[PDB]
């Protein structure tokens with residue numbers, strides 16, 4: 460089997476991407492944030508505290524003939540941005556882009572943090588990191604990909620995120636029309652439950668490539684590119700008037716600037732992030748200070764190849780017995 464779904468930026472800054480997902484019988488279609496940095500499929504639901512729902516589409520398990528309470532199971536998750544959600548668990552039929560999993564754990568939110576309530580565009584998350592990070596207790600649950608894997612034509616999914624445009628998540632096949640040149644594969648560590656890999660270095664603009672190992676995660680559910688402070692300082696030093704602002708919470712730059720590109724290494728290959736991808740616009744409406752899309756990871760404890768980096772590539776998440784990542788230009 461295969462599946463293919465379009466993913467759409469939630470706003471003009473590509474802050475995140477939503478992908479329609481069919482849950483239950485008859486289908487209830489919710490727009491989920493596909494997150495390769497987490498391993499829970501959770502949704503706004505009929506159980507979510509009413510004051511914490513503001514425009515999201517909810518899953519109502521009582522209206523699904525295939526929903527079953529997973530008796531005793533709870534979940535609770537805290538994300539790197541300080542957001543959180545928790546609740547109970549159903550199993551149900553879940554389809555993505557024509558690919559169907561029966562018995563998928565659908566984590567029904569009883570509580571969500573303010574950032575989730577405030578984002579009317581995201582009805583929940585679909586985790587695509589390794590199932591070892593799933594938070595369901597006392598019986599840990601599998602991701603949608605892990606449940607689908609054995610049925611897929613090839614045990615892979617691909618992320619093809621757009622810059623200010625829709626893109627695609629494919630399951631079970633590699634669309635050889637969706638990228639240019641060849642796919643370069645690189646090793647993955649699953650020891651922290653992430654798609655963790657080592658970039659071979661970077662360049663700023665037309666500058667020379669610096670060969671240096673940068674361990675980080677491929678994370679579709681993180682907007683920005685978080686890299687070591689040395690690398691980030693080297694990037695923003697090429698932008699007149701850029702500075703790190705403790706009050707704003709990262710590097711800002713004059714909105715009048717033209718940003719340089721940023722290149723990262725994948726083995727001997729190179730992915731180029733155009734400068735425009737690094738512009739996250741005014742820090743507040745009407746400001747001439749713009750927020751940078753490359754930020755320090757120093758306060759995180761891990762480097763994160765988030766959407767800013769991933770949207771510059773066609774990315775293969777290879778879930779074979781020994782997982783690997785693939786990157787191609789596009």
Ligand SMILES: Cc1[nH]ncc1CNc1ccn(C)n1
Nearest residue numbers: 474475538540542574575680
């Ligand atoms: C959607 C999400 N993934 N991880 C945490 C969150 C909630 N907070 C944010 C911060 C920017 N946005 C769009 N949503």
